[PDB]
Each structure stands twice: as C-alpha cells, then as structure tokens.
Amino acid sequence: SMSYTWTGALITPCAAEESKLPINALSNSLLRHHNMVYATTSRSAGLRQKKVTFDRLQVLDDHYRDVLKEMKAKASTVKAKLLSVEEACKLTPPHSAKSKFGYGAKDVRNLSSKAVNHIHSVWKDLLEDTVTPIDTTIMAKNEVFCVQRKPARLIVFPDLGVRVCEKMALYDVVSTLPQVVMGSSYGFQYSPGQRVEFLVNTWKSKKNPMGFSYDTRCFDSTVTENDIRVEESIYQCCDLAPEARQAIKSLTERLYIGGPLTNSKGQNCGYRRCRASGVLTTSCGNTLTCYLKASAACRAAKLQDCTMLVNGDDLVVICESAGTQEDAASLRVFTEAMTRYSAPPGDPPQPEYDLELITSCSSNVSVAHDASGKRVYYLTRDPTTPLARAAWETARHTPVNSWLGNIIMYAPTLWARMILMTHFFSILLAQEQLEKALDCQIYGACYSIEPLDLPQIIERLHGLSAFSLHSYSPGEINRVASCLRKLGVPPLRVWRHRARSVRARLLSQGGRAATCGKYLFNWAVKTKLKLTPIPAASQLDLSGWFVAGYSGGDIYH
Ligand SMILES: CC(C)(C)CCN1C(=O)C(C2=Nc3ccc(NS(C)(=O)=O)cc3S(=O)(=O)N2)=C(O)[C@@H]2CCCN21
C-alpha cells in the first residue's frame, strides 16, 4: 500500500517560522558564517511528502517467522502494569501540544478535572470502539542544520487526551519489553560509557571483525500495516490487565496502523498507512521491527555470528569477516533481504574493518588518553550540527536545549569541552542563571536538568577520565578543525583562553559553581587540580535515564 495519500491541502505552521539564524551580541563569539545555518519550516514539507510517499511490498520468509517466534517467547515473560490517569498525566511534558478539547499540558500536569474527565472518556471510548480511526495532526518539524538543504521532517501525533491514554496502556510495556526481547542488542539501555564499552567488547569478541551501519530510507514510511500488527502481537504476549489488552488492540487498529491526517488549521491532508512519528510506541515499534528484520536478514545472508545494536530505526551490525569479496557480497544479500522485508537502504551499507570508521547513532568510536596515560575509548560525532544548533540557541530560547543534551552525551569530546562548555557557562555566568533548571531531551524523553549538576552527571555517564582526557586522535582533530573553518568558529586556542576566564569566575563563586570550574575546566589550565570522585555523584537519582527510547512519545521524566 501507499505510505501516504494526499488531498493536496498544505501542511501548515502554528506560529511564524524562522529559517534564518537569529543573531544577537553573542553570535559572532561562537560562529561567523551565519548564512551556513538554517532551520527547516513547513514551507519545504511538500518536498518531504514527495520523498516519504511510496508503495511498500513485503515478502516474508521462514527466517522472519523464526525470529518473530523467538521474540514472542521472550515477550511472554513480561508482566506489565496499567498506569493510573494521575501517573500518566505526570509523564506529560509542560510544553506538550494542547488538546482540541479545551485544556492543555499544564491542566494535565496539575490534574484539572476538565483534563482528567476528558482523558477518562477517551479511555472508555477506546474500550468500547476498536475500529473508528482516531484523528491525527501532521506538522512540519523546525530543525537546525548547516548547509551541505534538507526539507522539514514531518510529525504525526494524536490529541493530548489520547496520548495520556497511550501512557496508561503502554508506558510500562515500551519501557520494559524491548530489553527483555532484545537483551544486549537494545541500544537505549546504555549510558554513552556503556554503549562504547559494548561496542568495543563486541568488536574484540570477533576473531576478524567487520561492522557496518544500515541506513533505511525513511524508516517510518517503510513500516507497513503487517509490521504494526506484528508489533501488537508482541505486546499482547505480555501479562497485561484485560483493560490494557483491549486498549492496546484498539490503539493499534484505530491509530498505530493508520488514520486520517489533519493540518493545524483543521483541514484534511490525507491518509497514513505507516508509522506515525509522534506516538508513544514509535521508538519501541521501530526497534522491534528493525531488530526483527535485521536478525532475519542476517540469517538469510548467512552473516557469521552477527551482533546487532539497535536504537529505533538505527542499526549497526558487527560480525566475523569472510574477507572483503564475501563481506561485500553478504551485505548485498543482507540488503536484498531487508528490502524484501520492506526496509530498503538510503545509502547502501559498506563493510568496515576499523571500529572508528563506523557511524551509529550519528556517532563513531574514537580514542583518547586519561591522566595516567591509559588509552580510553569514547563516543563522538562531527560537531557541525551540534554547533549550528548551539548557534541558534545562543540567540533564541528553545523548548529543548540541544546544547545541554550534547554536553551530557558528548562530555569526553574535544568540541563539547572546549567550545560548548566554555560558551554556555559564560552565558549562564553573565545572566546569573547557573541555578536555573533547563529542559533537554535524552533518548527522546524530556528532562529538567540543573547546569550545576553537570559534573556529577558527566562522572556517572562517562567516568572521571572525561574530565582528564588528552592527546586526541588526528582524525578527530582534523574533523573538528575543518568544522570550525567551515563555520567560522574561533580556533581552539581562543576557547582555551576564554575557558581560563570562565573557570576562574566559577571557582570565585564557591559551592557547586566552584565544582563545575574544577571538573569541567581542568583542561584549560597548565597546573592541574586533583580530580577525585564527586561526593554528590553517588547520591544522584539517575534511574530512568537509560531504560528506554521515547522519540516522539511525549515523555517527561
Ligand atoms: C553518544 C550516544 C550514546 C551514541 C548517543 C547519541 N545520542 C542519541 O543517539 C540520542 C537519540 N538517539 C536516537 C536514535 C534513533 C532514533 N530513531 S527512532 C525515531 O526512535 O525510531 C531515535 C533516537 S532519540 O530521539 O531517542 N535520541 C540522544 O537522545 C542523545 C542526546 C544527544 C545525542 N544523543
């Protein structure tokens, strides 16, 4: 079937959309080549619609059913609970889109009776009716990039009332099921420090390692009715309350499988027969479907001892090599199999024989040295998009502070420490806003974080070495330097100078500000301080950080 059918009506914005990088007094201190950075808008959505609209064919074999049988067997060991309305309301982000039915996210969060009553009636209706398609809104995402332009990504989501019901029915399932079914292969269970450890151990477990990432062309669009019905059959394997069972089937038939699309102005835009990016089960569904299809494709292509690492639609596979001729021919069969399962690639996969050349979750393995001269593996990426977005957020306040999520997940890196840490701590200092909790997304869920808790956070997710890493690789150094040149970002020597200043100001203030200055900026000074375990690091409640992915699932933690 066609992933989408269109009425010809336009995908529309809510407010005005900026595509040009906004510029304030602070912009040039980060980035000179302003015209390199742009944000997507609804006005390029027609180009995206084109791309994501295709027929899907699916041919399912015995390897496919075998793996599926395996997944169901493990899924049947899961016992999952129904969440109360109240519990589910509290999982709702403050900034979440308001209901068409006269209440918003904060009404939900403070449990107003208009919110609670409508939610109760959406749930009742789910139990009563398993056939009537639920309405969704299609919006264009506004995202920031550096020019190479990408058209806007689309987001399809149901009304807030329905989203709270999804939580009630499926939050425990999507939080717990994926690790049980997929074990060590489930990407979203890992801190960055654990993920790199898993990658290295896995590489090191192979006699002759070969790895490749697999980029599916528009994963959501490739997801068929069958796939969505298959993922539901996996949810129903769990020990569920009968109201959860009924709710899950109903959300599946009425929402997940497909339904009508409406713009922000209330016009009918068409119909969807593929994955919605803005539902609770988007991340879990993609991961189950990706791992199912990949595992089955691995058996068809006869890949030796293939180890999967899956994060929603993101797939890296590490296996035994059979030499370059055979590896290359194997990956073609792997791709043919995936293609038959309706997950063809955008870029064709290539085998890699160096772990550091594999990009997965937009990230590659790299190596640095700690205090004791010990080699240390850490995860990194091309700093171009992180810096473009940092540049946007330097002049515009945003719902998600990507800069902050990046500092958390890329703490050990050269660019995050020298540029991102320096720039943003300087800004918090000037505004006396160090104490101010900021929102950011990690693995799709929204977190309220205090910038001053960063030292503890970094210690827990990466280890202390993150505060002591030096002697980065020429590869990493070259990519960073060429990013700064391309973007017009001051050289790293400037950032070192600025940091000594930022550091001194932090230390001057004592308390947690001083802690940040000591741990985050030890690299800036020649005469280093001694970095011991942070007392507060062990006290931090970081449970719920690396349990699951929730991309598009409206989760606040
Ligand atoms: C350093 C690390 C450990 C390699 C992580 C890098 N990395 C992320 O991979 C990430 C992330 N990964 C995803 C991958 C694939 C999908 N596909 S889907 C739509 O669910 O089907 C979704 C998501 S996400 O939205 O849950 N967010 C983060 O949220 C964090 C935060 C800054 C960047 N960082």
Please say whether the dihedral angle defined by the alpha carbons of residues 342, 346, 351 and 354, taken in this order, is positive or negative. Answer: negative
Cα angle 298-300-303, degrees, rounded to a multiple of 5: 45
Question: Known binder of ligand: residue 61?
Answer: no
Residue closest by Cα to atom 34 of ligand 1: 409
Please name the residues in contact with 297: beta carbons below 8 A apart, sequence gap of 6 or more.
63, 334, 337, 338, 341
Count of C-beta atoms within a 10 Å radius of residue 175 = 18
276 Cβ below 6 A of ligand 1: no
Q: Which atom of ligand 1 is nearest to the CA of 402?
A: 32
Burial zone of 435 (CB within 10 Å; 0-12 exposed, 13-18 middle, 19+ buried): exposed
Residue 231 main-chain phi, psi, to 5 deg? -60, -35
DSSP bridge pairs for 438: 449
Technique used to solve these coordinates: X-ray
DSSP annotation of 468: T
Q: Which two tokens stand for residue 496?
A: 């070192």
CA of 323: how far to CAs of 294, 297, 320, in Å?
21, 19, 9
How far from 173 is each of 229, 249, 277, 429, CA to CA, in Å? 16, 14, 18, 42
| CA 551 centroid distance within chain | 6
Hey, what's the torsion of the CAs at 137, 138, 143, 148, to 10 degrees? 170
- Gyration radius of the chain over CA positions: 24
For residues 272 and 155, what is the distance between their CA atoms, to the nearest angstrom? 12
Resolution of the structure in the document, Å: 2.3
Residue 508: partners with Cβ closer than 8 Å, 6 or more residues away: 514
What DSSP letter does each residue of 330-390 carry, written as one string? HHHHHHHHHHHTT--BSSPP--BSSGGG--BTTBEEEEEE-SSS-EEEEEE--THHHHHHH
Ligand 1 atom nearest residue 552's Cα: 19
Supply angle C-alpha 382, 387, 392, rounded to 5: 145
SS3 content of the chain, % helix, strand, coil (to 5): 50, 15, 35
Helix (H) or strand (E) holding 547: none
Dihedral pair phi/psi, residue 259, rounded to 5°: 155, 170
For the CA of 314, the closest atom of ligand 1 is 15
Calculate how far, in angstroms, residue 363's C-alpha sits from the geometric centre of ligand 1.
10
Does 129 carry a binding-site annotation?
no
Q: Judge if the beta carbon of residue 405 lies within 6 A of ligand 1.
A: yes
Instruction: Find out whether 215 is annotated in a ligand binding site.
Output: yes
Cβ–ligand 1 distance for 314 under 6 Å, the answer yes
Q: Using H for helix, E for strand and C for coil, what is the string for 57-123?
A: CCCCCHHHHHHHHHHHHHHCCCECCCCCHHHHHCCCCCCCCCCCCCCCHHHHHCCCHHHHHHHHHHH
Residues 119, 89 contacting (CB under 8 angstroms): yes
Q: Cβ(549) to ligand 1 under 6 A?
A: yes
CA 312 to ligand 1 center in whole angstroms? 9
Tokens of 331: 């990956």
Using alpha carbons, select from 490, 497, 496 the residue that is nearest to residue 28: 490
| Top mutation candidate among 144, 155, 443, 457 for ligand 1, by most atoms within 8 Å of CB | 443
> Residue 263: is it exposed, middle or buried by C-beta count within 10 angstroms (0-12/13-18/19+)?
buried
List CB contacts of 139: < 8 A, sequence separation 6 or more: 11, 13, 14, 42, 154, 155, 157, 264
Domains and CATH numbers, the chain: 1-55+133-158+258-273 (no CATH), 56-132+159-186+224-257+274-280 (no CATH), 187-223+281-363 (3.30.70.270), 364-557 (no CATH)
- Please report the atom of ligand 1 found closest to the CA of residue 192: 3
Nearest-CA residue for ligand 1 atom 16 is 312
CA-nearest residue for atom 21, ligand 1, is 312
CA distance 286 to 206: 27
Torsion of CA 522, 528, 530, 533, to 10 degrees: 20
Q: Are 360 and 309 in contact (CB under 8 A)?
A: yes
> Which residue's CA is the nearest one to ligand 1's atom 12?
443
Structure tokens at 323: 């030499």
Q: Ligand 1 pocket, 163 CB below 6 A?
A: no
Burial-class residue 324 by CB neighbours within 10 Å (0-12, 13-18, 19+): exposed
- Closest Cα to residue 39, out of 155, 150, 142, 154? 142
Q: In ligand 1, which atom is closest to the CA atom of 285?
A: 21
Type of residue at 350: Q
DSSP H or E segment with residue 237: none
First-residue to last-residue Cα distance in the chain: 37
Residue burial 33-54, b: 16+ Cβ < 10 Å; e: rest: ebebbbbbbbbbbeebbeebbb
Amino acid making up residue 509: Q
Rounded Cα distance between 92 and 427, Å, is: 29
**How far is the centre of ligand 1, averaged over its atoms, from the C-alpha of 311 (Å)?**
7
